[PDB]
């Protein structure tokens, strides 16, 4: 038998906002004879035959499972993509962490619109502040880093926030 | 005009008086500011207690000194609906926005309360002057939507100011209206009246008089 | 307008400026101060003239993780009342240029308030509680303080309207003291105290009781 292909996301974020570009890149081995890659979105076959698949401007309809397959691979396990609506989205490489892991949160704004006076909340309490937008790093995770998390700031003069998201810390 | 956050919406109540007299037409008013020239198109949807209504009337755009458009939509409400407590939702959609803005307005909530209307003559110490102060105390009312006017011998008296409502220790509201007239007029024995209109008054109206003795 | 700390500048209380027993102050409040750039320098100016007597507290972190810092300048009663200007210039690694803010008493020919107490209306004596009114009109500027008192104790249960711009450019307000009807019938004596710069010794009172 034959190894299964996998779908890679560039950028890596499993959650994105409408209008975000996202590139799905299929990785397996091709045959000499067959240069193609087939793409599924949920149950639908995507007509493009490309090595990698572009969602230039994401919509909520782009949400779901994505799989790919390459001329010398089995079909890929599915990869999940959630297109959210709004001004701000809290992005992270994932949401469960072991004690000691690094945590990298991003306070992504719709169309990269410049955001200032940015605060990252944990459990309804502002935790870290930046004057200009910046990612927030906890290089050594711990029991206390568990909670609900959001970010907010100002887009020009208007006040905005992300949906809140739970983070868990395991052993 | 940079406009990083796109438009903003402000939603307004009808004038207290238009809700209280059938003769008049109460309106709710949705005002969109900061509409860019680049993406000028604005679309309203209106909802009463959650159901979409279609009878609203949108005005054409207005260029402002700051170089942004202002766009206004006006929905006529039924007298009974406003007073019966219905929720008005204005939903506004523009390409500068990731999602529509929704604003809701309704009459204030709470058991209504009848205004007490007390009129008061000048302090003795004021009779020194060429002008005296005729005072109308209106208290113990809920909600704060009210209309207070003055008149004499049928005609409305022009020189008066009414303070805005003030929240009193018991949850109700009160205000004062001062009517300024000549000393002669008051001593000449003339009859003056404080007209109050409020939802809790029998027939939305009461009228107290004031004069010398 | 595009991100960094932020400055608020606050006038003294009208009472502190009017009464010689008190000490008025201007207060310069800086918020939204990073932990990464945390040192904040204030320069203070009276009618253009730098001054050095401000008392500036060390910075306190808020619930929201930002730093806040306050500078307090004591004012001369007469400097305030004569309309001098107070300027707070704030500076920080995070600021493209310093931020300056300015305050002063409001400008214009001051007018003396007329103070008139007015007794409850005839009809109100039905109720178990009545309204003693205190009308204060013809005053400029709008800065004012109005209290009530009886037999040496102050009276608690009153509400005073905002000033209202009157048609001659003066301001007026009303303050409504509420009292049990019994107290009014017994013949007790209530006072409207009023403080305002354009009054003699910045103070006057009219009294009110039954006939
Ligand atoms: C992170 O946290 C901090 C801390 O916040 C506080 O704690 C948390 C838990 C929250 O609960 C929060 O609600 C708390 O406030 C945040 O810091 C705040 O930041 C905001 C801005 O985003 C500030 O907002 C301005 O507030 C002004 C009102 O401030 C007073 O009133 C508020 C509440 O009503 C109080 O909380 C403040 O403490 C201020 O209170 C006054 O403080 C004075 C100084 O102590 C007192 O006077 C002194 O008193 C002493 C003795 O008591 C003597 O008497 C002294 O002599 C005297 O000097 C005074 O008594 C006191 N009054 C009280 C308690 O009533 C608003 O005025 C201002 O509005 C203007 O500017 C806005 C621009 O943002 C704009 O929206 C408005 O339109 C308006 O703009 C102006 O328009 C007018 C028209 O009339 C024009 O004339 C003006 O020129 C124009 N511009 C300007 C610049 O004026 C703001 O809303 C807030 O004050 C501040 N709080 C504190 C405590 O510092 C921080 O934002 C958080 N940030 C983030 C990103 O998370
Ligand atoms: C670019 O220009 C436009 C046009 O501006 C105009 O022209 C320029 C050249 C200048 O001259 C301006 O001075 C001039 O305004 C700007 O548009 C303005 O934008 C600001 C905000 O940026 C709006 O502020 C809001 O104002 C409302 C009250 O507005 C009424 O009263 C005004 C004067 O007081 C009047 O100008 C308005 O037209 C409006 O008038 C009413 O109109 C209705 C409908 O037609 C009519 O039936 C009424 O009779 C009439 N009334 C009167 C008295 O005339 C104010 O309520 C808003 O405050 C809320 O929001 C603030 C933050 O947004 C917040 O701080 C306050 O706390 C308050 O929040 C509310 O608080 C209450 C309780 O207090 C709470 O219950 C509410 O839920 C809560 N609401 C919210 C949303 O939080 C706000 O201040 C102007 O109205 C708007 N003006 C116009 C004419 O459209 C634009 O800002 C400029 N853009 C840039 C980038 O510079
Ligand atoms: Cl300078």
Author numbering:
A (entry chain C): 4 to 174
B (entry chain B): 232 to 444
C (entry chain A): 234 to 444
Sentences from the study reporting this entry:
A key development in this technology is the preparation of stable recombinant FcγRIIIa suitable for expression in E. coli, rendering a non-glycosylated receptor. FcγRIIIa was mutated for increasing stability in the absence of proper glycosylation, and to resist the harsh environment of the purification column such as low and high pH, and the constant shearing flow of solutions. Since the FcγRIIIa immobilized on the purification column has been mutated and expressed as a recombinant protein in the non-glycosylated form, it was deemed necessary to verify the molecular basis of the recognition for IgG-Fc. For that purpose, we determined the crystal structure of the complex at a resolution of 2.7 Å. From the visual comparison and the RMSD values obtained after superposition of the two crystal structures, no significant differences were observed. The RMSD of main chain atoms in chain A of Fc, chain B of Fc, and FcγRIIIa were 0.78 Å, 0.59 Å, and 1.1 Å, respectively. Consistent with previously reported crystals structures, no direct contact of the terminal galactose of the N-glycan of IgG-Fc and Mut FcγRIIIa was observed. The crystal structure did not show direct contacts of the galactose units of the saccharide with the receptor that could explain their effect on the affinity for FcγRIIIa. Crystallographic analysis revealed the detailed molecular interaction between Fc and non-glycosylated FcγRIIIa, although the structural data could not explain the molecular mechanism of how N-terminal galactose modulate the affinity to FcγRIIIa.
